[PDB]
Every structure is written in C-alpha cells, then in structure tokens.
C-alpha cells in the first residue's frame, strides 16, 4: 500500500534498496505482503524464536550420496506435429505411426489446473513455513477409520507428503517429507535453513524432513523410513518405471490380505510417499521441460501407469487423486482410437499394440462409454495366442503387452452389466487356454521373488475355478534355494487373486452361469460359438445334456453340461448321464482346420483337469497333432474334444 526503503550493511558500506509495492502488487495479484508480514513474528524476542527453532527436528545424519538423473522425456522426433492441449483439434495427428508431441506449457496448465493452500496452518508447519497458495495436485488417503491420514500435495516443482496420526486422544502427530529441486523449495519462515532439515541431497534435488522432535520420536516406534534409498529411487528412476514399481507393490499386496486392514508399519507408510512421488515425477518432468514439446509416446506410457496406479490405490485404500488429468491428452488419445480397427489390432506391431492400448485407457478412462476397447484387447490376446507355443509360460514381452491390454477388460468385469458379452467371453476363454501347469509355475516363481512374472497372468482373468491351494502346491517351484515360505505365501496370494467371492472380477457376466445350481462345485467354463460348456462336479446343472467322463473311485465327479445358445433348461436332464463316444479312426496328419472352434481338454482321472486348448487356427491344431501332446501311455489321462455342436468326444487313439 506504499513504498519501503531497505538499508543494510555490506562489507562496511551503507547500501540501501527500495522495494515498491504499488507496482509489484499489481504485477502479481496473488501477492499479499500484509499477511506475510503478519505471519512473520517480526516483534518476536530471540527467546521465543530460539525456543521455536529447538522444537523442530534437525537431521544429524546430514549427508547424501551423489546420484545421476536419467533422461526421462526424449528430444522431439523429426517433424513432430506439435499439438496444443488447449487447442486440441481433430486430424492434426493422422495415425499411430505419425510422429506427435504435446507442448509442455499449456499441458502443465491442465495438470495443475486446480489451486489451493499447499501448506496448512497446523501447529507443526506454522513454525517452519510461510502460508502458500499455489496451483497444485494432491493424493490423499486415510486408514484406521480416518485416524491415520496422508496427503501428497505437489506442484510441478516440489512434492510434500504429510503424515498425520490421531492417538485415540486429541493429540495429533505430524511428519512431512518434502522432495524437489533445492532452489524451488518453498519459502522458510524464521531462523531455519534447509541443510539442517535435509535428509538426503544430490545435485539440484533434496529430500527434506519437517517434524517435531517429539513427533519424530513417536513415529520412530513404528515408522523407520530409509530416506536415503527413497531419495535414490525418486531420482535415478524414470517417471514410467518408478510408477510401475509402486504399482507392483500395491497389486501384489492387494491380492494378499495386506490392504483389507492396513497396518501402521514402515512398509505401508513408505509406499504412501512413493505413490506421491509416482505422480509428482510425471508432472515434474512435464513442468521441468519448459516451453518445449513432450513426445506423445512418452505421455501414453507415463499416463497409462498413473491411470492403472490410480485404480489400484482405490480398491486398497480410499485414496483420491485430483489434478493429474489433462483432458487435452484424453481427447487427443480418443481421436486416434477412431483410426484403428479394433477387430484387427493384434495384427499390428507389438510396439504399436502397446502404444495403442495405452492411449485406449488414457483416452477412454472410467470404462462403460466405448465398449469397443475390448475387441482391441481381445484381438491382441488372440494374435498372441496363435503364435505362442502351447502350454508354455508366457514370455516377458508377451506378458507385458497383455498386461497393458488387460486393464480395459478388468474394468468391464467390475460392472454387473454384460458389456458386450461375446468378445469378453472369448478373451477369458483364450486366457483359460494359456493357464497351464507351467504358467502357474512361473507366476508362483514370480510371486516368491517379487519379480514381474507375478504382476499379471492370463490365469487371473480365466474361467478356471478348480485351482485350490493343494492343487497349486503341486505346480509350485520345488527348488530348495527358494524360500519355502515365499512359495507358501505365493500360493496364498495366487489363490487369493482367483477367489470368485469378494473379488467381483471373475464371473456373473456370461449368460450360461445362471444355469448352475451350486457355484462352488464349478471347475471350468468354455464359452464356444453358439454353445458354452459347464464343467463341474455338480449333477444338477440346467443344461441341454450331461456327459460324465470316467473319473475314478475317488474325487467328486466330472460332468460336462453343454448350454446351447446360452439359454438354460427348465430342469437338469434326467436319467443316467451320457457316455463320451471314443474315436480311433482319426489320423495325426491334417491339412485343414477340421477342429477350428472346438476345445480340447486333457484331464487326469485322479488329479482332475490338467491342460486346456482352444483350437483357434490351423497353427494351433498342427501344434497339437504333430507334437507329443497325445500321450496314451498313461491310462489315467484322457483327451476330451468339445464341439460347437454341443457334443463331447474322447480321442482314444490315432492311425
């Protein structure tokens, strides 16, 4: 509201500076030099000031190790078509193969669209920070009945994750971690300097801790973070890779009983911060690129992870994210999905398949609007199933691709409505064909080692409900070097993923499911064209017929109840079940598809179902016949052939 002159002594000279506010306050309408002057206790005796300084925890272990920042966003590709997130117009970008990049400045304007108070007026922060009001995004969550809270408020420059505990009395314990470039850190209030609060530093970045000596002691009873390592991972990793790291932890922890009743331990609280880092690293990289362009492929990969990461944190924790969605990117992605033929997506390059599937989820989030995305995911699994050697464990590259495309399918199963059943049932049938004894063995090996092989497996989305604990124990790795418990825990986790009940993402979308009497006795479902088979130990299945394979004098039963056209019957067929006709007049050499559309099951009399194959093309059939799949030496093994006509047949021998 006036001018002020500021005199000071420099090396013995009476220098003075004039700071105007009429001009400055006009040039930055958000500035209020009165609320800050009133915040700064300018008339505070040194006693009160020094007393405030000793309250705040200081980092005695003041050091950090040198770290190398990776190259996250790449240089603009040759002749990229610079899009504007605000001026998003159709036909700028032509196909998936056309080089594209989104400019950074207005793209950041959409990410950090919202604005609010970053730093609360709470008692621990009031001592250290000036009140701040900036464009921001935040990740928030609460556990223990809202008695333990966390909020990852962040900008394009720095992240601040704040823990707060309520101790069943009125007391509130607070501990906040600040991450970002040192120079861009918020403004400190009193005698404080960041080096006294730094827990890890390297180059331009730093990790600052802000808490009371008392509060630091309280948190140390259950929360001993590795501030050194968390800093290294937050710097040395790329935005996409870091977000996936956090994604695996939560996913592999959600299938377990880890996030149904979360505990206040170091591991859980550590991840809470890593989640905030995951989002910050994306917005930070876009904001730190300045007035340039960000390759579109980078956005597709990075924002796909956050989209998936946003869903996992929703089913485990009640977390919310506000401010990491640029509609301009969502639109631009949607426009490009009108370019691709979803029916033949799998015929594209694996590179462009993953590129397209990423834009699909980012372009069409919150599924239930464009159900054609499943056709694209189904086309990828089918094209991949025809080229994959039967009964083998999925390769690292194929598993990754299917994982990307599997998120769209997963969301539809959440919904109680069918959502274009046919293609959805086909995806699950192919998935059921891929879940062999070796696949399960590879998933469990990946769960016991926390590697990527456990993150996703087509078996999760399969129509196979015969996988019990003792049945998985048989297919688990028997290596003595692997931790016996990690394997025993893998089974508990694996099995926990395919619980039909309290999962909601396995069944009740097919129309042949309501024709069953007892759900827990179902073993496997094969939805074919114009028919779906209900393999179960349940005699009372309201189908068209009822076949009974020769089981044994042991386990419950094996029935095959074909449901024609997915329409139940008034009641279960009466009389002794039919006999499976055997076939010997059938040669091993075939030059045409004569088994397209059928399913070939291989079960053991005692052990039950072992392998499943869906003959989808000539390549699949030739792999069955030519290979050593048909082994009749074992009398307790049989091979059932399920036809689209509704018939079941046993292959007993070949020419």
């Amino acid at each position, epitope marked *: 509201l006036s001018e002020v002159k500021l005199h000071l002594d420099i090396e013995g000279h009476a220098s003075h500076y004039t700071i105007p506010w009429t001009e400055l306050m006009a040039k930055v309408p958000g500035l209020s030099p009165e609320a800050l002057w009133r915040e700064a206790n300018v008339t505070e005796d040194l006693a009160s000031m020094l007393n405030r300084y000793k309250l705040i925890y200081k980092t005695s272990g003041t050091l950090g190790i040198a770290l190398a920042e990776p190259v996250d966003i790449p240089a603009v590709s040759e002749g990229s078509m610079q899009v504007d997130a605000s001026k998003v117009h159709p036909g700028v970008i032509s196909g998936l193969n056309s080089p594209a990049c989104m400019l950074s400045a207005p793209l950041e304007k959409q990410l950090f669209y919202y604005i609010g108070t970053m730093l609360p007026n709470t008692r621990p922060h009031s001592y250290v920070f000036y009140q701040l009001r900036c464009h921001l995004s935040y990740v928030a969550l609460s556990i223990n009945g809202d008695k333990f809270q966390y909020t990852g408020a962040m900008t394009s420059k720095f992240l601040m994750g704040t823990y707060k505990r309520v*101790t*069943e*009395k009125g*007391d509130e314990h607070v501990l906040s971690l600040v991450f970002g470039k040192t120079k861009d850190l918020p403004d400190l209030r009193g005698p404080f300097s960041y080096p006294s609060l730094t827990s890890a530093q390297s180059g331009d970045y730093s990790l600052v801790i802000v808490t009371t000596f008392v509060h630091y*002691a309280n948190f*140390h*009873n*259950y929360f*001993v973070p*590795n501030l050194k*390592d968390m800093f290294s991972r937050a710097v040395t990793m790329t935005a996409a890779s870091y977000a996936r790291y956090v994604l695996q932890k939560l996913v592999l922890l959600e299938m377990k009983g880890g996030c149904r009743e979360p*505990e*206040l*331990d*170091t*591991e*859980t609280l550590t991840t809470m911060f890593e989640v905030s880092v995951a989002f910050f690293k994306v917005g930070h990289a876009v904001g730190e690129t300045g007035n340039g362009c960000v390759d579109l492929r980078w956005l597709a990969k990075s924002f796909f992870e956050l989209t998936v990461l946003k869903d996992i944190i929703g089913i485990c924790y009640g977390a919310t994210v506000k401010g990491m969605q640029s509609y301009g990117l969502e639109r631009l992605a949607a426009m490009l999905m009108a370019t691709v033929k979803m029916e033949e997506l799998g015929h594209l390059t694996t590179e462009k398949q993953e590129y397209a599937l990423r834009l699909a989820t980012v372009g069409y989030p919150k599924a239930g609007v464009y159900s054609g995305l499943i056709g694209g995911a189904t086309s990828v699994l089918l094209s991949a199933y025809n080229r994959h050697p039967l009964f083998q464990p999925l390769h690292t590259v194929m598993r990754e691709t299917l994982f990307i495309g599997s998120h769209v399918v997963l969301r539809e199963l959440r919904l109680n409505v069918t959502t274009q059943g046919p293609n959805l049932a086909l995806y699950q049938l192919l998935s059921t064909a891929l879940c062999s004894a070796l696949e399960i063995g590879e998933v469990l090996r990946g769960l016991a080692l*926390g590697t990527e092989s456990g993150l996703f497996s087509p078996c999760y989305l399969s129509l196979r409900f015969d996988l019990t604990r003792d049945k998985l124990l048989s297919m688990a790795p028997q290596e003595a070097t692997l*931790d*016996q*418990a*990690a394997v025993s*825990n893998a089974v508990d986790g694996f099995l926990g993923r395919l619980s039909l009940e309290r999962e909601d993402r396995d069944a009740w979308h097919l129309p042949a499911y309501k024709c069953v009497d007892r759900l827990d006795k179902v073993l496997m479902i094969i939805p074919l064209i114009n028919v779906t088979f209900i393999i179960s130990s349940d005699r009372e299945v309201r189908g068209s017929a009822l076949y009974e394979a020769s089981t044994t004098y042991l386990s419950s039963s094996l029935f095959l109840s074909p449901v024609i056209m997915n329409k139940c019957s008034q009641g279960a067929v009466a009389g002794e079940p039919r006999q499976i006709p055997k076939i010997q007049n059938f040669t091993r050499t075939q030059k045409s598809c004569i088994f397209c559309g059928f399913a070939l099951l291989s079960y053991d009399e005692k052990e039950g179902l072992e392998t499943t194959t869906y003959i989808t093309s000539q390549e699949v059939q030739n792999s069955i016949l030519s290979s050593n799949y048909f082994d009749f030496d074992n009398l307790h093994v049989h091979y059932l052939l399920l036809t689209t006509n509704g018939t079941v047949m046993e292959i007993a021998g070949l020419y």
Partner: antibody
Amino acid sequence: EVKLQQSGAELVMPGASVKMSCKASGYTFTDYWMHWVKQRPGQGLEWIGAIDTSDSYTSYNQKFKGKATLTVDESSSTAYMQLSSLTSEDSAVYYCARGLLPFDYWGQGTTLTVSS
Amino acid sequence: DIVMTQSQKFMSTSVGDRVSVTCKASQNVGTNVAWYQQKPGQSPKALIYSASYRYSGVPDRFTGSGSGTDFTLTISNVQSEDLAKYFCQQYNSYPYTFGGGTKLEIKR
C-alpha cells in the same frame, strides 16, 4: 538406567488367564512402545504384539489375536499382557521388550507354566 | 508373513578366527534388520540396529552389513565369552518376525 523387571514365574490352571506384568524404570515410560515376545525352550522368538503407552493404541498383528490382550497403566509405569484360555502349548518364556525399533532393552523373562 | 531364514543352526570356530552369520529375508526388508545375542540362561540383548549400526557399549568386534534380502552379522575377534545364539529380526512390516537362531560354538 533402563530396567524392565518381570515376575519370575506364573503358574495357572489350564483354561484360566494370567497377568504377566512388566514394570519399567529409568526413562519416561510413555515415550516408547512395549513389545512382547514368546520363546519356547531352545526354539526361536515369536513376536506377540505391541502397545503404544500413554495412548493405549493396541496393535496385535500376528496369530495371537485372541490369546494376547495388552494393557498399560501410566501411574505404576507398568505394561501388561493377558493370556486367555491357557493351553499346554502356551507354556513358555514371555519377554517384554522396550520398543525404540529395534528393541532397545529386554526384560529378564517370565516363564509361564500351565499344568494343574 | 515374512520369514527370516537363518539356514545354519550351528557354527563352530576357533578362538582367534572370525565368523559370519547369514540371515536371508523372504522379501525386501530394507535396512530395518536387528541382531540380538542370547547367552545361555539370559534374555536376548540388542547388538546392532539398522543392519549395520552398533549399539552403545558393544565392542567394535561386532559389525553389520547388508540391505534388502541378504544380511550378515560380522563377528571379527571371537572370545570365549561370545558363546550364544544370534537371532536376526525384521521390523519393517508387521508382523515383526525373527530368525531361527544360530548357535555359535567354540573349539579348543
């Protein structure tokens, strides 16, 4: 001088319940959690649970959910653990340990015997 | 639950040698590992914290090393008084779980 003194032994009939106190001295009892550990003769150490002093925030995080019941009294600076429906398998040494994360100090141990 | 695997239940060494107790975690545990010494007829006593930091009053003969999955307790200059069982503990995620114990024998 931090001390966690524990009663030498406790003999209780099967099916009944036991007291198992742990009196702390030499420090501010309320500024550190209290953890309980179970050890059978010659075997390993099983972590029963933990309780936050001055808040009574109870955290039983293992298979002793229905066995253990941790309580605290600030006046006497004591931390307790109650076993319910005692069985022969529960007869073992029970340590009370001060929690700085890790366990700074350990009590002398309370041997629990269940026979009649 | 996480299991702390101490494979070697017994280890015998001379008086002037060094010994290395191995602790293998079923998951990534970070630097949150503790080692306790339980001499016969005694309660365990805290030896090292954070998997490498030595408690006050314990001699410089004990040192810790490791991070993530493989942890080792380094006892350099053994003496007759070191006979005891050595446990490793993880306190990074509930439930806090201990190792199987490693009995240190002495030859003479």
